[PDB]
Symmetry: D2
Subunit: 217 residues, 4 copies
Amino acid sequence: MSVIKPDMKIKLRMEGAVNGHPFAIEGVGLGKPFEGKQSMDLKVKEGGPLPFAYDILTTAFNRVFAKYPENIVDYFKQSFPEGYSWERSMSYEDGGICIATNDITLDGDCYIYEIRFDGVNFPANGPVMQKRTVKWEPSTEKLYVRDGVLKGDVNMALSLEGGGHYRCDFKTTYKAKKVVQLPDYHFVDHHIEIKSHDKDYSNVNLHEHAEAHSGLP
Amino acid sequence: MSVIKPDMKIKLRMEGAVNGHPFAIEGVGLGKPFEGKQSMDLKVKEGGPLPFAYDILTTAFNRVFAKYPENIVDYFKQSFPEGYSWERSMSYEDGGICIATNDITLDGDCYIYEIRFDGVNFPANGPVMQKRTVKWEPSTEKLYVRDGVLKGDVNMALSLEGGGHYRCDFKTTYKAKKVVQLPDYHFVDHHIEIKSHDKDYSNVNLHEHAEAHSGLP
Amino acid sequence: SVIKPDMKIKLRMEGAVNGHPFAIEGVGLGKPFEGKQSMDLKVKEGGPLPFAYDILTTAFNRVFAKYPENIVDYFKQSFPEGYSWERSMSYEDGGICIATNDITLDGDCYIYEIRFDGVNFPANGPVMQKRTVKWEPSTEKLYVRDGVLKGDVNMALSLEGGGHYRCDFKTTYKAKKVVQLPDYHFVDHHIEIKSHDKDYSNVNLHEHAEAHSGLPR
Amino acid sequence: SVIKPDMKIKLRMEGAVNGHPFAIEGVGLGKPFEGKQSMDLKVKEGGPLPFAYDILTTAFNRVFAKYPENIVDYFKQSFPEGYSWERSMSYEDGGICIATNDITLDGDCYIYEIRFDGVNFPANGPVMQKRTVKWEPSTEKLYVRDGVLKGDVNMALSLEGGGHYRCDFKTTYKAKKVVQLPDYHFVDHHIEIKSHDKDYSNVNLHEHAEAHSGLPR
């Protein structure tokens, strides 16, 4: 509680590849960990203009930014100052698959992310390579302990240009760098949105709102 | 709206098999479709005492019983008097897999279910065949239209005897027997509970509470 | 010694696909040591089948596989008491079937009791639209797990007008008595509908199968 | 004609497993028409590797496969321009790896640029605990999809003290120029670590591979 604040900053670099084509993106942002709200500005540094839907990247750009009620243990805020890392697979219904990692540290009032992102087997005529996505729908992540660490699974869906949805299943493993108290089974509602972007997504402004809860009584 | 009521009745028969061993269960219940609450009493008629965790069956024992706000189209209540059917696969993390169908009709104030349930590849030393499950956790189902019908996917988890969770992914397809208005992407929170049961689950009293919503703003 | 060079087969399958029930009976003959068999199948209920017959055919016994002397034959050892199998068949478009077969022996005739169930086949997919031509030949991978025998296979249906539709099989085989367990091995398969009438009310089906150990070193 | 009976190989792989980065370089030689190859691999960064080396080895070219005259050889046709591949490797305990290889040709030497990433390997699983012995031999199933070549394979690692750990491979192969496309076919494989030092800093790896058409009729 001594290393967290109502207003915190964020710096990140992501290095990655999709279908074997490499890229890099850097980001600067800020957020309110107790309000579960954050935003950031992202710039493509290498590999631009990106030949795939930017939306596949956005959830890689920290569950610290989620409003936790007092009756649910907060694995993430506990993990600082040491921080935590996460690993994630994102399996799309047409066989496209991405995996990503984020190592999160803290310097003063600024979270620092080192992100790797890789994706393969996206069909050339699919919504990802043809940039036919509109946005992620809001979601509810299911979090539970497994082997002394925290898992989070979520059914995600991208709405598509001209209607319909493109589904993806997320499986995330979260690992605190120190021993923290482990939570009971719980949920985090999310809503991630690209608020603005330039024509080729070289510049993107991204927002997330997230709140933990215990489901129906 | 002429064939629905604040209080409705339910009759069902399920015929099925798990790992090749057949069984049959009948049920009688009642519920409040606008409150999203229901309960029923279930009796094993054949194949008892069941050699597997009763919990795998319980979600087969109707999304009519979910509280829908006025701003979300209600695919289910619209579908009557003709009714609707559903198909579901339930894929467990240890390779166990169940599929089920329910054809739902309506007679007076009573819903009538014809249910088939089949499951295979449950390991002999797994939580299902060793009856090590405690209950399903509450959940949030994600519902979206695909090919003119309604899909519902949910990350489910069974809490286990002595701690931890056993995960299962549900994919349901819902099919109205007449043309109804299709909803936008939305959610249904659920909480299913066995309220009471006898020693070998020959008799079970089952409750569900469910409410639709639109996620975080 | 209860296994003769020429043996007979009788079966009944009861099943449902997308909730629509059907029943099929079969009479055949095969040569266990040659790994070849054939049979005539008749739809008894639910005809004309509204789905691709090909999804059913591998449900219609690894006794009919030529094993070399240097590979333990789990199947031929299991008689006269017999064995059962359970199988999930997961199609790439989300269609999923599960099946069971209880196999017994009466004189020189194998008797099969088969249950088959399938759900979530899209209305416009190759199964509901009857766009399949045949299964490609395949190589099943077999290995022991928990004292029983597993067999996994990548299957593909060739499609009318070109291309393939993929399905992953996961089978569990369970001898009714204790038999000697094999090392990791393979069975090559080729299953074919040799003839059928217009609506597949009558089908003549053949299979050739041979076990092997793969490439050496 | 740019394909000679004896050819050389040079590669560099950069990667990460559970977020921990590493780099490996390789020098080898093979006989494209005999379907045999071998190579010496050296960890350059990230050593000693904290995970089972076996997960990496299939990333270290189907040019090295003996094709019969009656099967179109997608790989040998693709040179001198070369081809690339993308692959997902989904392990039965939820561990998942994805890899890419861009293959070019310089004189008589193939050059590989490989990226490898893996996540969600459980701390107590056979990969993180180094409990693997070797890959079993396998049969890859290859088929055209969207004008490119797919190859799927059921793989198994034998485990220290018995049993197997399963992995499903899905590979996409992409020629850099237009080549003639093959019919559905198979490639049998056998990959082996022939020697290694204590911490796998040095590894000698061999593969034998032969294409075929499966059982006839």
